[PDB]
Amino acid sequence: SKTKEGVVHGVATVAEKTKEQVTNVGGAVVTGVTAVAQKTVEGAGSIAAATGFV
Amino acid sequence: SKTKEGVVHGVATVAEKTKEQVTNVGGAVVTGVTAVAQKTVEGAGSIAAATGFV
Amino acid sequence: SKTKEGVVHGVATVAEKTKEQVTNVGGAVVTGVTAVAQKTVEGAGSIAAATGFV
Amino acid sequence: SKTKEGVVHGVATVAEKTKEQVTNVGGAVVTGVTAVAQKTVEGAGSIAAATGFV
Amino acid sequence: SKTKEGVVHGVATVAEKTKEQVTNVGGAVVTGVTAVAQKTVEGAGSIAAATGFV
Amino acid sequence: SKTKEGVVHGVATVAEKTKEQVTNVGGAVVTGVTAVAQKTVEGAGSIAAATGFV
Amino acid sequence: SKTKEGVVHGVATVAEKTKEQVTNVGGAVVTGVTAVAQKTVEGAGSIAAATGFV
Amino acid sequence: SKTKEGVVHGVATVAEKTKEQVTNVGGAVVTGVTAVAQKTVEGAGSIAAATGFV
Amino acid sequence: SKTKEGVVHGVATVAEKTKEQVTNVGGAVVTGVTAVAQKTVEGAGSIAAATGFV
Amino acid sequence: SKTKEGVVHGVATVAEKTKEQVTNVGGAVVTGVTAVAQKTVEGAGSIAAATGFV
């Protein structure tokens, strides 16, 4: 009854004068992940994952 | 009863004068992921994932 | 009863003077993903995924 | 009863003076994905996915 | 009863003075995907996917 | 130059399942005034004003 | 230059399941005034004013 | 240059399940005044003012 | 240059399950005044003022 | 240069399960005044003022 899994609610965000600069050369960059949710039953659940080379 | 999986609600966002600059050279860049949700039963669930080379 | 999977609701967004600049040279860039949801039963569910080369 | 899968509702968006510039040279760029949803039963469900070369 | 799969409703969008510029040279660019939904039973369901070369 | 007096713009409103009930007996009731504007030069400017008796 | 008087803009509002009940007996009731603006030069400017008797 | 008087902008509001009940008997009630602005040059400027009797 | 008088901006508000009950008998009640602004040059500027009798 | 008088900005508010009850009998009640601003040049500027009788 009233089960809740991986939930995000009641989020208030204010950004006035944010300045974000990203310079990438042959890699991986993850920025600005806000108010996200997921649900993985049989598998790998990654949020904001970065890998450079294999 | 009233089950909830991977849910995002009640999100209020204000951005006034945001400045975002991204320069990429042969890689991967993920920016600005907001208010996202998913549900994977049999598989890999990735949100904002970055890989450069294989 | 009242099951809910991968849902996004009640989102209010205001952007006043956002400035976004992206320069890409032979890679992958994902920006500005807002209010998205999915549902994968048998497979890989990726949201805002970036790969450069294979 | 009242099942809900991969749903986005109740979204209010205001953009006043947004400026978006994208320069691409032989790659992949995905920007501005808002209020999207899907449902994949047997397959790979990707939203805003970017690959450069194979 | 009242099943709902991959649905987007109740979306209000206002854009006042948006300026979007895209310059592409031999690649792939996807911009401005709003209020979309789909349903794939046996296949790969991609929304706003970009590939450069094969 | 570019003068602006009493202006309302860029309003996005979503109402899903609002229920409003008003019972009045010999008075005055004002409800639900949204996105209104006026301009009075020589006079009394009232918005959503209620008086019962005189 | 670019003067602005009594202005409301960039308002995003979402109401999901609001329930409002008003019972009045010989008075004055003002509810739900949203996103309003005015401009009075020579006079009394009242917004959502309530008087019962005179 | 760029003068601004009595201005409200960049407001994001989400209300999920608000319940408001008002019972009035021969008085004055003002509720729910959101995102309002005015400009009075020569006069009394009242916002959400309540008087019972005179 | 860039003068600003009586201004409210960048407000994000989320209300989930608020319950408000007001019972009035021959008086004055003011509740829920959010994100308001004004500008009075020659006069009395009152916001959310309550008087019972005169 | 960049003068600022009576300004409220950058306000993020979340209310989950607030319960407010007001019972009034021939007086004055002011509750819940949030994110308000004004500017009075020649006059009495009152915010959330309550008087019972005169």
Per-position DSSP letters for C1-54, written without gaps between them: ---EEEEEEEEEEEESS-EEEEEEESS-EEEEEEEEE--EEES-EEES-EE---
Structure tokens at B37: 């949700």
Edge-to-edge strands of the sheet including I29-37? Answer: F29-37, G29-37, H29-37, I29-37, J29-37
Q: Which residues of F touch D14 (CB under 8 A)?
A: 10-12
Nearest to I12 among H6, H12, H22 (CB): H12
In 10 A of CB F40, how many CB atoms?
Answer: 19
Contact assessment for residue B13 and residue C35, using Cβ atoms and an 8 Å cutoff? no
3-state DSSP assignment of residue I28:
coil
3-state DSSP assignment of residue E48:
coil
Distance CA E32, CA C48 (A): 14
Q: In the beta sheet, which residues pair with residue C22?
A: B22, D22
Structure tokens at C46: 């990726």
Give the resolution to one decimal, in Å.
2.7
Q: Which residues of G touch C14 (CB under 8 A)?
A: 10-12
Contact assessment for residue I12 and residue G12, using Cβ atoms and an 8 Å cutoff? no
CA distances to D5, F25, H5, H32, I4 from J7, rounded to whole Å, are 44, 41, 10, 21, 8
3-state DSSP assignment of residue I26:
coil
Q: Is the dihedral of CA J6, J29, F37, B13 positive or negative?
A: positive
Q: Rounded to the nearest 5 degrees, what angle is found at the Cα of I42, between the Cα atoms of I38 and I47? A: 35
Which of I14, I16, I17, I34 to mutate against chain A (most A CBs within 10 Å)? I14
- Residue B21 class from Cβ within 10 Å (0-12 exposed, 13-18 middle, 19+ buried)? middle
Distance CA D35, CA C10 (A): 11
In the block, tokens 């996004």 appear at: C8
Q: Do F14 and D11 touch (CB under 8 A)?
A: yes
Contact assessment for residue C24 and residue G22, using Cβ atoms and an 8 Å cutoff? no
Residues 6+ apart with CB under 8 A from F3: G3, G4, G5
DSSP annotation of A48: S
In the block, tokens 């995002």 appear at: B8
| Number of alpha carbons in the 13 Å side-chain half-sphere of residue B25 | 3
Residue B28 Cα to chain centre, angstroms: 14
Distance CA A20, CA A17 (A): 10
Look at residues J39, I31, H40 and name the one whose alpha carbon lies nearest to residue G39: H40
CA–CA min distance F18, chain G (Å):
5
Q: What is the DSSP string of chain D?
A: ---EEEEEEEEEEEESS-EEEEEEESS-EEEEEEEEE--EEES-EEES-EE---
DSSP annotation of A23: E
- Residue F2 class from Cβ within 10 Å (0-12 exposed, 13-18 middle, 19+ buried)? exposed
Distance CA I46, CA I39 (A): 10
Distance CA C1, CA C9 (A): 19
Look at residues H10, F2, F9 and name the one whose alpha carbon lies nearest to residue A14: H10
For residues J41, J43, J46 and J50, what is the CA-based torsion angle, rounded to 10 degrees?
-170
Distance CA C12, CA H35 (A): 15
B37-50 exposure pattern, b = at least 16 Cβ within 10 A, e = fewer: bbbbbebbbbbbbb
Distance CA I36, CA G46 (A): 13
3-state DSSP assignment of residue E29:
strand
Distance CA I11, CA E2 (A): 36
Q: How far apart are the first and last CA of chain H?
A: 45
Q: Do F14 and E13 touch (CB under 8 A)?
A: no
Considering only CA atoms, give the Rg of chain H.
16
Strand locations in chain G (E): 4-15, 19-25, 29-37, 40-42, 45-47, 50-51
In the block, tokens 């598989």 appear at: B43
Distance CA I17, CA I11 (A): 19
Q: Do B10 and H14 touch (CB under 8 A)?
A: yes
Distance CA A20, CA H42 (A): 46
Nearest to C21 among D21, D38, D44 (CB): D21
Distance CA F33, CA F23 (A): 18
Look at residues D20, D31, B16 and name the one whose alpha carbon lies nearest to residue E17: D20
Which of A14, A16, A17, A18 to mutate against chain J (most J CBs within 10 Å)? A14
Distance CA E29, CA E48 (A): 9
What residues of C form the annotated binding site?
9
In the block, tokens 């994932």 appear at: B49
Residue I4: which H helix or E strand, with range? strand I4-15
Residues 6+ apart with CB under 8 A from I39: G5, G6, H5, H6, H38, H39, H40, H45, I5, I6, I45, J38, J39
Structure tokens at C39: 């549902």
Distance CA D10, CA G9 (A): 20
Distance CA B11, CA B34 (A): 10
Chain breaks in chain A (C to N over 2.5 A) after: none
Q: What is the DSSP string of F5-30?
A: EEEEEEEEEEESS-EEEEEEESS-EE
